[PDB]
Curated annotation (Swiss-Prot):
It is found in: Peroxisome. Belongs to the ATP-dependent AMP-binding enzyme family. Its EC number is 1.13.12.7. The keyword Thylakoid does not apply. The keyword rRNA-binding does not apply. One of its GO terms (cellular component) is peroxisome. GO terms for molecular function: ATP binding; CoA-ligase activity; metal ion binding; Photinus-luciferin 4-monooxygenase (ATP-hydrolyzing) activity; protein-folding chaperone binding. GO terms for biological process: bioluminescence. This is Luciferin 4-monooxygenase.
Length: 431
């Protein structure tokens, strides 16, 4: 110390001001003004929704929730499998500083109850197939006073859709392109309450999404903003890996192709036909594609990268997948729910097998001795600790669990074993 604290380089672009709502609003308004720019594509049903459509419905949902009465003292739950509609109430609530709690749509009723007992939402957005579970949770959590169906146009089984709800509360003359997103304190207004014994609520201020948005547009730590870039994401939107890659893709103006049910031929054909440049996989899908022999039958010449993951993958698995996809390697990244997003990212092209990446801008990371907490040195194995502005502000009504994890020095103890090498690539040791 000082040379055993690994530091992230400066951001290519300075850190934008304003809330996460404001930066999303600003970027998506610009993309909305180009007709036909695609935001999301559902691979199963083949429908595209454009930035204009997405911007206007999100702005309308923002103003409708504001006029309903929701403010920074309220939370919503968005409970739905990955869908064209998922990010509409997410964006609307961020535009007005209402915290959003994504609800694992393959939670059973009990997992659902505990998730929402922590987040205490006033309004629930849910897909049709989640409705009866929400209703049963409402019997035990009557703070849920309003339930809105996401994947309907008309009312559904007595409940308003997002479209009928918006119509009920927009003022006459509402103009989507005059709407101004709320300004408020970036550090103290919670953007997301993510789920991590029993899961905890992880409160993430807007600031931490604003920092992710720096990483997402970064030419080294994210993606170059280039027109007609398309992503294939098969990662759940309600978990932090899918939440904050997708928001970053929206701020980049990318086309986000989604699948909520993995199928081998549909995935490969979607890579081919949508000329996908980046594909996102959960760890166990890497093992799957290590076994796949169909990859050669598809034109994947546009494929530039495959990114992971919660994980970390084995070095052997990542090398086998990379070979099959005729790529030089896998672009890994590492983070926890409590760090918002990845705080260790494989730099563009700076690719190394088994490595999880380097420290991201605004962060620092070290490896401490498992017995003493002392800062270790190159290739020394110990506990990974990270410090930076994407760390959560704490667990929700659980300051004891918060303090076990983050000291007064603001260092986050990942509970993972790690080491960094000569060129400062981090590796995670599997326990
Ligand atoms: O558990 C948990 C919560 S958040 C999270 C991750 N976020 C990212 C983001 C990017 C990435 N890889 C970049 C994308 C170009 C390489 C890997 C990961 S892993 N994991």
């Amino acid at each position: 110390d000082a040379k055993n604290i690994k530091k992230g380089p400066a951001p290519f672009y300075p850190l934008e001001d304003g809330t996460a709502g404001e930066q999303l609003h600003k970027a998506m308004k610009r993309y909305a003004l180009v007709p036909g720019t695609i935001a999301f594509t559902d691979a199963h049903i083949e429908v595209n929704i454009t930035y204009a459509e997405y911007f206007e419905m999100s702005v309308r949902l923002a103003e409708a929730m504001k006029r309903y009465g929701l403010n920074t003292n309220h939370r919503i739950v968005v409970c739905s499998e990955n869908s064209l509609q998922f990010f509409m109430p997410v964006l609307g609530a961020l535009f007005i500083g209402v915290a959003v709690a994504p609800a694992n749509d393959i939670y059973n009723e009990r997992e659902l109850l505990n998730s929402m007992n922590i987040s205490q939402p006033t309004v629930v957005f849910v897909s049709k197939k989640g409705l009866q579970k929400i209703l049963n949770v409402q019997k035990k959590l009557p703070i849920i006073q309003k339930i809105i169906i996401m994947d309907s146009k008309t009312d559904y089984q007595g409940f308003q859709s997002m479209y009928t709800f918006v119509t009920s509360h927009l003022p006459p003359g509402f103009n989507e392109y005059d709407f101004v997103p709320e300004s408020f304190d970036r550090d103290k207004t919670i953007a997301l309450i993510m789920n991590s014994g029993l899961p905890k609520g992880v409160a993430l201020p807007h600031r931490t999404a604003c920092v992710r948005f720096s990483h997402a547009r970064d030419p080294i730590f994210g993606n170059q903003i280039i027109p007609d870039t398309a992503i294939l994401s098969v990662v759940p939107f309600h978990h932090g890996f899918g939440m904050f890659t997708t928001l970053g893709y929206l701020i980049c103006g990318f086309r986000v192709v989604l699948m909520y049910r993995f199928e081998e031929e549909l995935f490969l054909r979607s890579l081919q036909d949508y000329k996908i440049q980046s594909a996102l996989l959960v760890p166990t899908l890497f093992s799957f594609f290590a076994k796949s022999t169909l990859i050669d039958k598809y034109d994947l010449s546009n494929l530039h990268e495959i990114a992971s993951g919660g994980a970390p993958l084995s070095k052997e698995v990542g090398e086998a997948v990379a070979k099959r996809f005729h790529l030089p390697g896998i672009r890994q990244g590492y983070g926890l729910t409590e760090t918002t997003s990845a705080i260790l990212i494989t730099p563009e092209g700076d690719d190394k097998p088994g490595a999880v990446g380097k420290v991201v801008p605004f962060f620092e990371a070290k490896v401490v001795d498992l017995d003493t907490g002392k800062t270790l040195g190159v290739n020394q194995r110990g506990e990974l600790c990270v410090r930076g502005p994407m760390i959560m502000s704490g667990y929700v009504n659980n300051p004891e669990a918060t303090n076990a994890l983050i000291d007064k020095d603001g260092w986050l103890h990942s509970g993972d074993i790690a080491y960094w090498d000569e060129d400062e690539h981090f590796f995670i040791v599997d326990r």
